[PDB]
Design a binder for this molecule. Structure first.
Ligand SMILES: [Zn+2]
Ligand SMILES: [Zn+2]
Ligand SMILES: [Zn+2]
Ligand SMILES: [Zn+2]
Length: 140
DNA sequence: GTCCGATCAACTGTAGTTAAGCTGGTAAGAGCCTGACCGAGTAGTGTAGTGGGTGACCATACGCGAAACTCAGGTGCTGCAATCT
């Protein structure tokens, strides 16, 4: 895989000056300046569904760090991008919309009908230690 | 939808606030490439299980031949009798 990407598919080289760069990111920045079109805003947001464009690389660095920070779900630690990403993923845990089933983390048999009732099993066969966070998190 | 016409400022007459860069010695933006660090990507891998087809060995079958066994053919004398003498 490395041989193909270093002897035949020269993807890390400039299309114009024939320098090369240690990551595609720096090649992109290089093309955006040293071989740039007459465009006023040489930088464009690299992320999903974002259409914004910028004059100086520092403003793009700021925009990525502000509006596309890479987060982990507070409950399930799965990664997501930006405020919308977190708010979209938080629906999955929501007990008002997602009228989910109720089970033990270990015991195969459980089949509760309400959240308060599920805490009886975790309060007796387990205890207040090693209950799952989605059950515990009365955060709203 | 349109009608009147009041009315913030559109577009119209002159009176007074903004850089650029010179002498310098200088630290300030905006920056570059090698390097390091973790997350994720490319993708062949590591046990583990379902199926199939090959191979060996058997026995079952007929069909031709091989020897078996049963029952009746065949040899040869002579005890007894009859033809020729
Ligand atoms: Zn180049
Ligand atoms: Zn963006
Ligand atoms: Zn979550
Ligand atoms: Zn249990």
């Amino acid at each position: 895989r490395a041989h193909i990407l270093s002897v035949h598919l020269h993807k890390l080289t400039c299309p114009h000056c024939n320098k090369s760069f240690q990551r595609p990111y720096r090649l992109r920045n290089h093309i955006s300046k040293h071989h740039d079109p007459e465009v006023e805003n040489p930088y464009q947001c690299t992320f999903a569904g974002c259409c914004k464009e910028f004059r100086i690389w520092s403003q793009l660095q700021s925009h990525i760090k502000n509006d596309h920070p890479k987060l982990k779900c507070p409950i399930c630690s799965k990664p997501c991008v930006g405020e919308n990403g977190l708010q979209m993923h938080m629906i999955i845990h929501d007990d008002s919309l997602v009228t989910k089933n109720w089970k033990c983390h270990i015991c195969p048999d459980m089949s509760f009908s309400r959240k308060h009732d599920l805490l009886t099993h975790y309060g007796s066969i387990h205890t207040e230690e090693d209950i799952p966070l989605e059950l515990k998190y009365k955060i709203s």
